[PDB]
Amino acid sequence: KKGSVVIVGRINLSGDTAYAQQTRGEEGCQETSQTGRDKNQVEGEVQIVSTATQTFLATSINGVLWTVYHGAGTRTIASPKGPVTQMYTNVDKDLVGWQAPQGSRSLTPCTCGSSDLYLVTRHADVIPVRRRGDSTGSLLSPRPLSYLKGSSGGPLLCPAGHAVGIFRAAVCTRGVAKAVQFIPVESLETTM
Ligand SMILES: C=C[C@@H]1C[C@]1(NC(=O)[C@@H]1C[C@@H](Oc2ncc(OC)c3ccc(Cl)cc23)CN1C(=O)[C@@H](NC(=O)OC(C)(C)C)C(C)(C)C)C(=O)NS(=O)(=O)C1CC1
Ligand SMILES: [Zn+2]
């Protein structure tokens, strides 16, 4: 079969400093994927998650751990209670959700209306994005695709640290992203 998505690290957004911590290497992974059973307690708002050869991110908002379909597929996620089946799946939005793991802290949907956003990458870089549309934002500095690869599923935050959306796709030209496309938190709330 397909295995379970496996948490292999996490990104802290609490406090004053965003940072990444690796929690599981490629070795432990295989067995966790197969069983869906992961002894590890979940911490933090953003998980670094993995399938057999690829990693991406998952963000807890409103008690649901959200990520992208093009990463998770229809997969279950490994947890200390065994494989957790997806709570939400929407292929057209590229969205999947699981009940937020114990004991993740969950982000609050933003109702600020700020146009100044921040995208959190898999390395825990926090990069400024200017909101442009409902689901797009411009990068202040263009980035090569390689830099944003594996950060899908991560959060776009407002200045106060609320979730504005989930990074879905890079708006790019000839391998350079000038903007990011995301699932707005309102679309998530609608899916709920
Ligand atoms: C390099 C950074 C990007 C952020 C990143 N996401 C991507 O690569 C995404 C994947 C794909 O989009 C979509 N797939 C499936 C869908 O449904 C199942 C979609 C439903 C709706 C929409 Cl919107 C898009 C969808 C193409 N794409 C692009 O970003 C593409 N961009 C793009 O399509 O841009 C527009 C949407 C503006 C056209 C392109 C490949 C050209 C960069 C990533 O890191 N992925 S990853 O490495 O973590 C991997 C999960 C393991
Ligand atoms: Zn806000």
Tab-separated table of C-alpha atoms and ligand atoms in Angstrom:
chain	number	residue	atom	x	y	z
A	1	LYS	CA	0.000	0.000	0.000
A	2	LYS	CA	0.878	3.655	0.339
A	3	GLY	CA	2.513	4.324	3.706
A	4	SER	CA	1.545	6.988	6.210
A	5	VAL	CA	2.888	10.518	6.115
A	6	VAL	CA	5.537	10.729	8.837
A	7	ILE	CA	6.488	13.747	10.947
A	8	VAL	CA	10.259	14.189	10.703
A	9	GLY	CA	10.604	17.582	12.355
A	10	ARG	CA	8.895	20.791	13.354
A	11	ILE	CA	9.012	24.584	13.152
A	12	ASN	CA	8.326	26.700	16.221
A	13	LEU	CA	6.487	29.966	15.721
A	14	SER	CA	5.835	30.670	19.389
A	15	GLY	CA	7.864	33.293	21.224
A	16	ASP	CA	10.359	35.576	19.528
A	17	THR	CA	12.253	33.186	17.270
A	18	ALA	CA	11.191	30.846	14.470
A	19	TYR	CA	13.400	27.771	14.286
A	20	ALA	CA	13.484	24.266	12.908
A	21	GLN	CA	14.214	21.028	14.760
A	22	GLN	CA	14.763	17.680	13.117
A	23	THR	CA	13.136	14.873	15.096
A	24	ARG	CA	13.441	11.737	12.981
A	25	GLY	CA	15.988	10.690	10.331
A	26	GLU	CA	15.432	8.495	7.251
A	27	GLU	CA	16.132	5.353	9.228
A	28	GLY	CA	13.330	5.370	11.817
A	29	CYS	CA	10.976	6.496	9.087
A	30	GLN	CA	10.292	3.293	7.190
A	31	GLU	CA	8.756	1.507	10.113
A	32	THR	CA	6.672	4.524	11.103
A	33	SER	CA	5.394	4.801	7.513
A	34	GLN	CA	4.411	1.136	7.423
A	35	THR	CA	2.724	0.880	10.832
A	36	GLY	CA	1.410	4.433	10.994
A	37	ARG	CA	2.467	4.322	14.646
A	38	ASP	CA	4.819	7.088	15.840
A	39	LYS	CA	5.903	7.273	19.457
A	40	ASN	CA	6.687	10.894	19.148
A	41	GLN	CA	4.554	13.489	20.813
A	42	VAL	CA	3.787	16.426	18.519
A	43	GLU	CA	5.052	19.925	19.397
A	44	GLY	CA	4.689	23.216	17.611
A	45	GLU	CA	2.420	24.775	15.018
A	46	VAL	CA	4.213	23.572	11.868
A	47	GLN	CA	5.298	19.995	11.187
A	48	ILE	CA	7.955	18.915	8.730
A	49	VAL	CA	6.390	15.806	7.158
A	50	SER	CA	7.638	13.181	4.759
A	51	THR	CA	6.624	10.548	2.301
A	52	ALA	CA	9.108	8.001	0.964
A	53	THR	CA	11.448	10.466	-0.743
A	54	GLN	CA	9.908	13.925	-0.360
A	55	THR	CA	9.317	16.382	2.477
A	56	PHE	CA	6.913	19.239	2.830
A	57	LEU	CA	5.139	21.029	5.682
A	58	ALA	CA	1.899	20.850	7.607
A	59	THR	CA	0.310	23.646	9.592
A	60	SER	CA	-2.095	23.357	12.497
A	61	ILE	CA	-4.970	25.908	12.303
A	62	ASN	CA	-8.204	25.779	14.282
A	63	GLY	CA	-7.435	22.292	15.613
A	64	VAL	CA	-6.795	20.795	12.173
A	65	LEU	CA	-3.384	19.933	10.796
A	66	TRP	CA	-3.464	21.110	7.220
A	67	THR	CA	-1.246	20.295	4.302
A	68	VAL	CA	-1.225	20.009	0.511
A	69	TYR	CA	-2.782	17.124	-1.380
A	70	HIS	CA	0.104	17.053	-3.863
A	71	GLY	CA	2.301	16.090	-0.898
A	72	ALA	CA	0.073	13.920	1.306
A	73	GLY	CA	-2.060	12.218	-1.320
A	74	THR	CA	-4.872	10.349	0.427
A	75	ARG	CA	-2.458	9.121	3.020
A	76	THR	CA	-3.041	8.694	6.706
A	77	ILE	CA	-0.570	10.371	9.101
A	78	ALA	CA	1.396	8.390	11.653
A	79	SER	CA	0.627	9.198	15.278
A	80	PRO	CA	1.163	7.761	18.704
A	81	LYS	CA	-2.306	6.161	18.487
A	82	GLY	CA	-1.731	4.641	15.062
A	83	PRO	CA	-2.578	5.843	11.568
A	84	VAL	CA	-4.922	8.814	11.466
A	85	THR	CA	-7.273	8.988	8.474
A	86	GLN	CA	-7.725	12.325	6.764
A	87	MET	CA	-10.491	14.439	8.165
A	88	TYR	CA	-10.600	16.630	5.053
A	89	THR	CA	-9.631	16.069	1.427
A	90	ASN	CA	-10.225	18.456	-1.464
A	91	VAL	CA	-8.323	17.749	-4.616
A	92	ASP	CA	-9.428	20.884	-6.415
A	93	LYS	CA	-8.039	23.084	-3.599
A	94	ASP	CA	-4.951	20.899	-3.161
A	95	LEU	CA	-5.945	20.537	0.478
A	96	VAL	CA	-5.883	17.889	3.109
A	97	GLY	CA	-6.582	18.079	6.826
A	98	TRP	CA	-6.194	15.797	9.824
A	99	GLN	CA	-7.395	16.372	13.363
A	100	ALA	CA	-4.673	18.372	15.038
A	101	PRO	CA	-2.275	16.126	16.903
A	102	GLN	CA	-1.829	16.042	20.588
A	103	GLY	CA	-0.250	18.382	21.631
A	104	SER	CA	0.238	20.719	18.847
A	105	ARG	CA	-0.490	24.322	19.430
A	106	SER	CA	-2.772	25.646	16.784
A	107	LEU	CA	-2.559	28.942	14.899
A	108	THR	CA	-5.492	31.341	14.896
A	109	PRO	CA	-7.032	32.399	11.625
A	110	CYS	CA	-6.178	35.941	10.891
A	111	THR	CA	-8.949	38.528	10.840
A	112	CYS	CA	-6.568	41.546	10.583
A	113	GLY	CA	-6.819	42.192	6.924
A	114	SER	CA	-3.153	43.068	6.839
A	115	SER	CA	-1.490	43.192	3.450
A	116	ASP	CA	1.921	42.480	5.040
A	117	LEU	CA	2.448	38.759	5.211
A	118	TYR	CA	5.283	36.419	6.044
A	119	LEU	CA	5.905	33.016	4.530
A	120	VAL	CA	7.542	30.444	6.771
A	121	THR	CA	9.816	28.009	4.918
A	122	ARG	CA	10.955	24.514	5.761
A	123	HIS	CA	14.217	26.008	7.084
A	124	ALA	CA	12.207	28.337	9.328
A	125	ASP	CA	13.098	31.372	7.279
A	126	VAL	CA	10.395	34.042	7.556
A	127	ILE	CA	10.151	35.962	4.311
A	128	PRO	CA	8.012	38.994	3.585
A	129	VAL	CA	5.144	38.721	1.110
A	130	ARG	CA	2.878	41.536	-0.005
A	131	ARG	CA	-0.707	40.336	-0.331
A	132	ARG	CA	-2.008	40.910	-3.881
A	133	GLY	CA	-5.239	38.913	-4.255
A	134	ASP	CA	-7.393	36.487	-2.261
A	135	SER	CA	-4.867	33.712	-2.809
A	136	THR	CA	-1.661	35.421	-3.998
A	137	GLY	CA	1.162	37.473	-2.607
A	138	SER	CA	4.261	38.992	-4.153
A	139	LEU	CA	7.741	38.186	-2.891
A	140	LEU	CA	9.767	41.244	-2.030
A	141	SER	CA	12.788	39.437	-3.408
A	142	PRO	CA	12.330	36.801	-6.150
A	143	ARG	CA	13.537	33.361	-5.211
A	144	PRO	CA	14.723	30.392	-7.216
A	145	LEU	CA	12.195	27.540	-7.100
A	146	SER	CA	14.760	25.374	-5.346
A	147	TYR	CA	14.556	27.662	-2.361
A	148	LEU	CA	10.760	27.270	-1.887
A	149	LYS	CA	10.574	23.581	-2.808
A	150	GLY	CA	9.460	21.482	0.157
A	151	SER	CA	7.816	24.455	1.928
A	152	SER	CA	4.305	23.804	0.604
A	153	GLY	CA	1.876	23.253	3.422
A	154	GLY	CA	3.597	25.976	5.450
A	155	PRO	CA	1.963	29.077	6.724
A	156	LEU	CA	1.565	32.578	5.466
A	157	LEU	CA	1.311	34.718	8.631
A	158	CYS	CA	0.168	38.285	9.315
A	159	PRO	CA	2.336	40.659	11.461
A	160	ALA	CA	0.607	39.379	14.596
A	161	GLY	CA	1.404	35.730	13.848
A	162	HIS	CA	-2.082	34.599	12.845
A	163	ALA	CA	-2.542	32.252	9.860
A	164	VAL	CA	-3.554	33.986	6.630
A	165	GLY	CA	-3.137	30.846	4.506
A	166	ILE	CA	-1.269	27.699	3.483
A	167	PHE	CA	1.452	27.861	0.822
A	168	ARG	CA	0.223	25.910	-2.220
A	169	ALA	CA	2.168	26.879	-5.323
A	170	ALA	CA	4.903	29.211	-6.535
A	171	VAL	CA	3.987	31.790	-9.159
A	172	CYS	CA	6.962	31.424	-11.394
A	173	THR	CA	8.671	32.181	-14.649
A	174	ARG	CA	11.683	30.279	-15.968
A	175	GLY	CA	12.350	28.700	-12.537
A	176	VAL	CA	12.091	31.946	-10.541
A	177	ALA	CA	9.226	32.657	-8.155
A	178	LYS	CA	8.069	36.250	-8.077
A	179	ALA	CA	5.019	35.454	-5.964
A	180	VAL	CA	3.341	32.718	-3.968
A	181	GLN	CA	-0.127	31.247	-4.268
A	182	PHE	CA	-1.831	29.945	-1.152
A	183	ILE	CA	-4.993	28.523	0.278
A	184	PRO	CA	-6.578	31.379	2.210
A	185	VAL	CA	-7.624	30.628	5.716
A	186	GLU	CA	-11.230	31.497	4.727
A	187	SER	CA	-11.191	28.615	2.238
A	188	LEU	CA	-10.016	26.302	5.042
A	189	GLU	CA	-12.801	27.504	7.270
A	190	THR	CA	-15.212	26.905	4.411
A	191	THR	CA	-13.914	23.375	3.976
A	192	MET	CA	-14.697	22.866	7.687
B	1	LIG	C1	8.491	25.160	-5.524
B	1	LIG	C2	7.428	25.555	-4.535
B	1	LIG	C3	6.136	24.915	-4.530
B	1	LIG	C4	5.354	25.173	-3.433
B	1	LIG	C5	5.471	23.911	-3.931
B	1	LIG	N1	4.206	23.574	-4.717
B	1	LIG	C6	4.196	23.049	-5.962
B	1	LIG	O1	5.250	22.710	-6.526
B	1	LIG	C7	2.927	23.000	-6.670
B	1	LIG	C8	2.491	21.605	-7.050
B	1	LIG	C9	1.489	21.859	-8.222
B	1	LIG	O2	0.325	22.640	-7.900
B	1	LIG	C10	-0.774	21.921	-7.630
B	1	LIG	N2	-0.724	20.580	-7.529
B	1	LIG	C11	-1.862	19.869	-7.273
B	1	LIG	C12	-3.061	20.532	-7.082
B	1	LIG	O3	-4.235	19.892	-6.780
B	1	LIG	C13	-4.123	18.540	-6.352
B	1	LIG	C14	-3.122	21.920	-7.209
B	1	LIG	C15	-4.332	22.583	-7.028
B	1	LIG	C16	-4.354	23.970	-7.123
B	1	LIG	C17	-3.190	24.672	-7.375
B	1	LIG	CL1	-3.263	26.378	-7.484
B	1	LIG	C18	-1.980	24.015	-7.567
B	1	LIG	C19	-1.958	22.626	-7.469
B	1	LIG	C20	2.402	22.682	-9.042
B	1	LIG	N3	3.035	23.597	-8.038
B	1	LIG	C21	3.660	24.740	-8.318
B	1	LIG	O4	4.135	25.432	-7.449
B	1	LIG	C22	3.725	25.210	-9.786
B	1	LIG	N4	3.211	26.576	-9.782
B	1	LIG	C23	1.966	26.865	-10.205
B	1	LIG	O5	1.238	25.968	-10.637
B	1	LIG	O6	1.559	28.139	-10.139
B	1	LIG	C24	0.216	28.491	-10.452
B	1	LIG	C25	-0.791	27.804	-9.512
B	1	LIG	C26	0.093	29.995	-10.241
B	1	LIG	C27	-0.095	28.166	-11.906
B	1	LIG	C28	5.163	25.146	-10.326
B	1	LIG	C29	5.604	23.701	-10.333
B	1	LIG	C30	5.187	25.677	-11.774
B	1	LIG	C31	6.157	25.968	-9.464
B	1	LIG	C32	6.165	22.839	-3.226
B	1	LIG	O7	7.140	23.119	-2.517
B	1	LIG	N5	5.774	21.584	-3.420
B	1	LIG	S1	6.667	20.462	-2.585
B	1	LIG	O8	8.111	20.451	-3.027
B	1	LIG	O9	6.579	20.701	-1.098
B	1	LIG	C33	5.835	18.761	-2.952
B	1	LIG	C34	4.791	18.422	-1.981
B	1	LIG	C35	6.071	17.695	-2.018
B	2	ZN	ZN	-3.792	38.961	11.639
